[PDB]
Amino acid sequence: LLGTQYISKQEYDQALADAQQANAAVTAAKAAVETARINLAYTKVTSPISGRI
Amino acid sequence: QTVRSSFNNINASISSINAYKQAVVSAQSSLDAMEAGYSVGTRTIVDVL
């Protein structure tokens, strides 16, 4: 509706913000998910080297 | 009666304009309120219409 009748440029911008807003939240959960995962599959081997155990 | 008929009318008639004349003013900025609010796009154009 941008430029059209109801879109109400500011009110639009509110939404675009929101999608802007929540995605960053999505950034977080992913980071969280990314976090927790690296905790889970973290277990265990191998360290930062290969060779005789 | 007719003497008092319209003589009232006109006066009340007077009151009429004074209301709507203000009322026009009421809508007047009311329009203006819209256009700016639409000009800045805080609001739609339909309202202005």
* Facing residue for B46 by CB, picked from A5, A9, A11: A5
Q: Is B43 on the interface with A (CB under 8 A)?
A: yes
From the list B37, B41, B33, B47, the residue with the least C-alpha distance to A12 is B41
Whether the Cβ atoms of residue B15 and residue B24 lie closer than 8 Å to each other: no
CA angle A16, A17, A21 (to 5 degrees): 120
**Residue B37: count of CB within 10 angstroms of its CB:** 17
Q: Does residue B3 sit at the A interface (CB-CB below 8 Å)? A: no
Torsion of CA B27, B30, B34, B36, to 10 degrees: 130
Q: B17 — contact with chain A (CB < 8 Å)? A: no
